[PDB]
Amino acid sequence: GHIVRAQRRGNGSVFQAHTHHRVGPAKFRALDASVISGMVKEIIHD
Amino acid sequence: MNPVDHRHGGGSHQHMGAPGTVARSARPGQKLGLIASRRTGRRRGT
Amino acid sequence: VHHPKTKKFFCKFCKKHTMCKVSQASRGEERHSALGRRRYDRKQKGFGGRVKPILRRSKKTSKKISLRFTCQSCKKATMYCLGRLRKFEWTVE
Amino acid sequence: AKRSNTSAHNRSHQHHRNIHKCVVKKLWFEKGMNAKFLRNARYAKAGQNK
RNA sequence: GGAUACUUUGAGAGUAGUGUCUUAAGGGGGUGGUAUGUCCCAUCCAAGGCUAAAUAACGUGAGAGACCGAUAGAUUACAAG
RNA sequence: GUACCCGUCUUGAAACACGGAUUAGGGAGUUUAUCUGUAGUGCGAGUCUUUGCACGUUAACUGUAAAGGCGUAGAGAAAGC
RNA sequence: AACCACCUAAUAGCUGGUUUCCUCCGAAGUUUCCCUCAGGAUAGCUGUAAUGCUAGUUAAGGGGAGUAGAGUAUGGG
RNA sequence: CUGCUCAGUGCUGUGUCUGUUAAUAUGGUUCAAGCCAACGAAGCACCGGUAAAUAGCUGGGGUAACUAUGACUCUUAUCAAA
RNA sequence: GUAUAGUAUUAUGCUUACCUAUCACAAGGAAUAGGACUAGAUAGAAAGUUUGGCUGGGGCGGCACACCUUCGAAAGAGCAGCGAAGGUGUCCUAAGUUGAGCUCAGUGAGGACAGAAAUCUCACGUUGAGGAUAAGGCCAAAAGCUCAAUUUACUGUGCCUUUUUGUACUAGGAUCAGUUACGAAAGUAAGGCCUAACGAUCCCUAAAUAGCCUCAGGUGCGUGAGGAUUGGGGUGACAGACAAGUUACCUCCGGGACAACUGGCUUGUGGCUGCUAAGAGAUCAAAUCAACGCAGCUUUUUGAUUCUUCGAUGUCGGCUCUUCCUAUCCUAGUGAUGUACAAGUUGCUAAGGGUCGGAUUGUUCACCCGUAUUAGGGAUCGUGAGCUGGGUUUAGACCGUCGUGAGCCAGGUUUGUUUUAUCC
Structure with missing residues (x-):
């Protein structure tokens, strides 16, 4: 037998995320100890 | 696809x-196919 | 077939006929200190499967019944062999 | 596949090229014969030479 | 050193090596080719190191021949790797 | 007058079996180890001189010490004989 | 199940080939055993080396046989 | 518009109550090697779930007022349903 | 690692080990994850390998693969086939051994109930019964049946036959050396009246009142092990590997030792024709049919076979063109008649000429519509470097049954490369 398409996603040549136009990693700011105000500069679509 | x-x-x-459930x-x-399927078929109710 | 539980028989060591209590012979289970067995144990270890054969194509369902004529004067057994039997009984009469 | 099983055509020819008569060394065969007879036949020979 | 697993040996109830776990003694310990305890006799003292000569030589460089004599002898006798 | 085309496997080939356009030159039972048997040769209850040493007009040839090989006693699993 | 080199002149109970002359002798396709039937081993048939000091026929006497033929025990009719 | 079937084969458990089971450790026994016990996880067995998992799903007689057909009725299939 | 509750081990806290965490945090988890070594469990994810022989080709079927009986087998020995008719993988402490006594199967007559069959009696009774079973031998004061006592179905080594052109094992046979049984005794008994009823090395295992040799420094002491001698555990493919499929995606070696394909031999089957008549034919066997039988011809059907071809004779049908055969449908000429005419049925000579247009089907063949009345064959089933490629027969794909599956299927359906002449 050959190696099956389910197994071939691991080796990860053509099966990688198309991550070029993605604007950044979506997360909070780090914790750093009260209350902190934050203006929404803009809302964008990635 | 062929057997290989x-x-x-x-x-x-x-x-x-073959049984198709593994x-x-x-x-x-x-x-x-269906990995560790504790049920199959039409989920009627529940 | 039926067989007597005591009969007269030539004791090889006493060199004469004398009556002797007969019994069916002991198939011993093999000890692991046997030299042949020891070779097998060491050889079975490692890789490369089972080593020596076992007989898959074994037809016949029969066994030659060896008896054990345990003497009473001599005190020594001397093994007689019958033919091959499907069943073996003691005589009650 | 199916070739011949046997023949005797020219068995006779080969046998007669040479039916040699195998001769016996002596008529007594002391491996056989009665031991009780041969036992006494020793003591006939042993007693005579003395 | 021991148990166990693998490789290895002519080494056979383990010849040698290695993994894992375990781990001594020092008026004592190893070896004596069948496992095990036990009594004698014999013979050596492991777990550190250095050391010429006899020995090897299908690579490279620089006299001999019952061998070949340009389709042979090296792929190459010559502006041949 | 006579005369089928060679080579080949085959019970059987002139075959409508296969190889073969012509010519020259290359082109296939050899050698080693352990043995078998026959014949030749030398010594003979002995025989082999080689691993090696001493020689040399030097890989040869020649000389020679002592082991060792096979033979000289066999049967038996073995003890013992 | 790519290509290149090497292990590798891998193995083949199978196919094809296998180079001078004269001279004397001259087969076998059969038995037993084999995961044996396109192959082996063993005997036979053949050649050679030799070495020691009757018969592949008939007659005469005497054993053996159940074929061809033939024919109210068993069978068929 | 997607009927019926969890018997086999799968897979599976807010499934363990028992039966079978390895090294090891604990216990007995010998002068020692060793031998005899008992113990016991997962897995299997046992008990539930599952078919838009894999699959599976009938044959034959009698029978209505001319004959004909068989609404109706009887019987069998596998450890599931016809 | 550690602190505390409880039954050396369970429970839930601790962080500093360690860990996730982001590479740099800070938290949270926690003596656990994970890793390392060992053990058990898991229907091809992956690897390696196997998947007999015989055979009028192979497959399926069968065992003729080890043994035994009769026949084939040709009156010595020997003799083959998937030749003929069968049998064996056991059964029995009596269905063995010994001694004694008796005679069976059957037929005939009799005898309360008694009948075709119950038990009793006499007479004849060469063995046809019975002797574990296949078949063939063998047997009558027995080898049968009955009664009684018994364990020779015993121990140990050589020898012989089947069988030596192949020595073995199995089975059988004659002894010697023991010992027992039975009989008054001579004797008989080494299983079953005789021919089938079974098996190597290696390894394991049992036999010894607990024996005979060895464990290499001890003529060592317990345990333990190893030997020689005698059986058993088993190989039916029976001189004895341990072993499932599929390939139409296929590869290689070879094979005309072996099939599909033309030819050859053969002619059962197919086709065609005689001889005879037992009657059909109103009457009447022979105008015309022709049984039950018997004898031939043919190679236009299909078998059977394996001689040729597997380092390849391009395989079905149609299209196109040639020639040949006659077992004559028409045309030429003739005879018969249940021949008035006409249309017919039928025999003989004749192969010069004629023998067709279409619908469906790949068709050959068949079957209808229509016409000038209307036969069938051969030539490598004429004819592919003349064509066509519809069919058959590759690789794609679908349906249905079968198979767990890969895959299969004279079951169906669709898409699928047809080369070269300039040589004689």
């Missing part, structure tokens, strides 16, 4: 043949 490419492949008439213990290459 995938587990379900091959035969004169297209059909699965364990957590089953290997790479072997985990194809």
